[PDB]
Amino acid sequence: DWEIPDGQITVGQRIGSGSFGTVYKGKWHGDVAVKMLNVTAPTPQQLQAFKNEVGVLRKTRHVNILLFMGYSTKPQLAIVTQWCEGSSLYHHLHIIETKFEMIKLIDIARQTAQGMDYLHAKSIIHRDLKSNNIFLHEDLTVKIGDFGLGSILWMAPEVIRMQDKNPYSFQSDVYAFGIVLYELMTGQLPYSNINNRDQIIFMVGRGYLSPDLSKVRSNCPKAMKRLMAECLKKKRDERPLFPQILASIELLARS
Amino acid sequence: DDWEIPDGQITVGQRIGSGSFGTVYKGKWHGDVAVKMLNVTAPTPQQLQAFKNEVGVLRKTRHVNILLFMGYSTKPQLAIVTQWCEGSSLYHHLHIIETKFEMIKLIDIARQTAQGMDYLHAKSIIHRDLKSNNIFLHEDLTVKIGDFGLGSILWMAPEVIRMQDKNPYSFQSDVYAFGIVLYELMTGQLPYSNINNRDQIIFMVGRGYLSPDLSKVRSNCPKAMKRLMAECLKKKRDERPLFPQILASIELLARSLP
Numbered sequence: 001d002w003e004i005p006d007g008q009i010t011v012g013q014r015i016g017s018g019s020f021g022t023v024y025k026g027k028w029h030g031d032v033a034v035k036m037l038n039v040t041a042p043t044p045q046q047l048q049a050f051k052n053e054v055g056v057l058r059k060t061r062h063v064n065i066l067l068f069m070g071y072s073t074k075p076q077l078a079i080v081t082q083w084c085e086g087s088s089l090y091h092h093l094h095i096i097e098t099k100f101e102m103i104k105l106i107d108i109a110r111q112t113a114q115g116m117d118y119l120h121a122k123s124i125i126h127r128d129l130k131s132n133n134i135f136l137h138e139d140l141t142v143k144i145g146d147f148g149l150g151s152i153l154w155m156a157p158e159v160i161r162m163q164d165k166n167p168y169s170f171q172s173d174v175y176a177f178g179i180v181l182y183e184l185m186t187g188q189l190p191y192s193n194i195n196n197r198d199q200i201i202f203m204v205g206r207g208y209l210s211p212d213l214s215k216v217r218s219n220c221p222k223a224m225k226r227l228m229a230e231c232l233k234k235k236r237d238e239r240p241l242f243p244q245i246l247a248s249i250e251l252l253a254r255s
Numbered sequence: 256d257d258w259e260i261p262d263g264q265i266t267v268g269q270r271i272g273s274g275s276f277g278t279v280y281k282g283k284w285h286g287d288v289a290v291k292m293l294n295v296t297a298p299t300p301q302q303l304q305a306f307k308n309e310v311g312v313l314r315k316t317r318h319v320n321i322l323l324f325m326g327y328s329t330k331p332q333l334a335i336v337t338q339w340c341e342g343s344s345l346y347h348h349l350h351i352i353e354t355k356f357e358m359i360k361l362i363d364i365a366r367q368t369a370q371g372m373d374y375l376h377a378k379s380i381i382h383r384d385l386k387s388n389n390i391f392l393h394e395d396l397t398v399k400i401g402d403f404g405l406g407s408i409l410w411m412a413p414e415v416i417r418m419q420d421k422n423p424y425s426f427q428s429d430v431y432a433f434g435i436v437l438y439e440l441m442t443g444q445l446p447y448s449n450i451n452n453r454d455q456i457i458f459m460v461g462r463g464y465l466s467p468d469l470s471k472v473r474s475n476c477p478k479a480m481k482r483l484m485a486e487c488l489k490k491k492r493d494e495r496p497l498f499p500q501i502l503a504s505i506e507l508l509a510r511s512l513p
């Protein structure tokens with residue numbers, strides 16, 4: 001059991017509202033992050049969406065995943081995780097424009113791949129891997145979570161198109177990671193020279209548009225570009241699963 | 256939930272420490288991990304039981320200041336997997352390589368150690384064996400309380416030494432061990448450094464003739480901290496404060512220095 005008895009959680013300052021509920025910095029045995037629905041009465045579809053997020057988070061125990069600590073039913077539906085420190089990768093790369101050395105860019109890539117490999121082993125498709133959902137905790141450990149405060153740049157073509165009810169795959173996560181690798185090695189978002197959204201969508205969908213890999217920094221290894229392209233392949237089952245990605249990196253890493 | 260790990264997944268690598276209880280290795284399971292194994296083939300009822308008790312405890316913990324339990328494995332050999340800490344144990348820092356942390360940092364380490372203990376006690380878990388070695392200073396920044404043993408006398412409270420009941424262990428018994436760690440932090444030494452005989456230490460602490468020497472604390476150790484130590488080291492269980500109160504005391508203390 002991971003219920004947290006009513007009365008123990010202190011909710012602090014508001015951080016933002018996602019699709020689910022609202023995230024606050026709180027205090028429960030130290031600094032913790034609390035995501036809660038701000039409603040009097042939750043509908044059975046929300047009651048369920050909560051149970052699934054909790055069902056998923058309780059299955060995780062890994063240094064590179066947001067540490068889930070517990071939930072609360074009364075007074076509000078609420079999920080407590082660890083309170084991260086620093087800022088997201090999205091922030092680092094495109095807002096404050098941190099200038100990481102390549103050795104760290106690679107190490108970040110590795111830790112991200114590490115968490116993703118773990119989730120996939122546990123049969124969890126993330127469905128929204130992107131730099132903003134990646135926190136650089138204490139500026140050195142990667143923590144994958146859901147931090148949304150929609151996100152098409154990380155979507156694979158088959159996802160874009162949406163032929164199926166469900167198009168999500170281990171492979172769809174891999175593509176997203178391939179875009180995250182783009183962000184790392186370019187320091188930039190993709191398709192920066194196109195100002196129209198629907199076109200970006202159409203084209204990526206139709207395989208007319210793909211990330212401009214020449215834009216990567218020059219000290220970026222040739223194995224790492226090669227890996228980048230493999231995760232970005234427009235055809236699903238040509239993309240490698242994470243065990244192979246993790247190996248590819250570890251190889252070049254020790255050289 | 257089911258935290259069993261499938262067979263042939265874990266790669267036990269270099270050995271890290273032996274001991275007649277079991278063995279700990281650096282390993283590979285979704286990155287770097289620590290792997291405590293039992294190093295016989297056929298485990299006894301007493302070994303199997305004690306294994307289920309350690310898992311039983313660990314899986315009830317989820318907190319930054321607690322060593323992250325990741326999974327267990329029965330086939331082929333019994334094994335427990337935790338996160339791999341990069342860094343050194345706090346004992347190792349203070350007594351082996353003698354790291355000199357600045358005072359604000361020492362207090363932080365105490366704040367976290369207390370933070371995680373508060374957690375455990377609020378989850379009705381008594382460590383029984385808190386000490387500098389069982390505290391890892393992960394990545395030189397976060398504290399991780401674990402149990403790296405395979406008694407440890409300097410941290411036992413008088414009533415624990417006198418073997419009053421079968422269970423002299425208490426939240427307070429743990430608080431006394433914490434007080435000894437604070438002493439390690441603020442002096443950088445183990446207590447009773449001028450005594451070389453173990454029976455005498457036991458006998459004396461048991462009888463109340465020997466208290467840790469608080470004159471030895473660093474000159475810049477605050478008065479409030481020094482008080483808190485003596486409060487934690489009280490010879491009588493009941494006069495020892497519990498961790499909510501401790502943490503609170505530390506946190507008031509903390510804001511009055513950069």
Ligand SMILES: N#Cc1c(Oc2ccc(F)c(NC(=O)Nc3cccc(C(F)(F)F)c3)c2)ccc2nc(NC(=O)C3CC3)sc12
Nearest residue numbers: 023033034035066079081082083084085086144145146147
């Ligand atoms: N926002 C936020 C946030 C955050 O988001 C949450 C909070 C609670 C949740 F349940 C969740 N929930 C999840 O992550 N759920 C989830 C769902 C599906 C899959 C996964 C998983 F594990 F696969 F990633 C997680 C997220 C957690 C920590 C945190 N720290 C921050 N620090 C700062 O803002 C500044 C440095 C001072 S912000 C922040």
Ligand SMILES: N#Cc1c(Oc2ccc(F)c(NC(=O)Nc3cccc(C(F)(F)F)c3)c2)ccc2nc(NC(=O)C3CC3)sc12
Nearest residue numbers: 279289290291335336337338339340341342400401402403
């Ligand atoms: N030794 C070791 C070790 C370690 O000990 C373990 C391993 C597995 C366990 F199950 C356990 N078991 C427990 O922690 N059990 C336990 C039992 C009761 C209560 C508690 C708790 F969580 F309350 F503290 C834990 C311990 C874990 C990580 C680790 N990392 C190290 N890194 C280095 O030394 C490198 C130089 C940088 S060493 C190391």
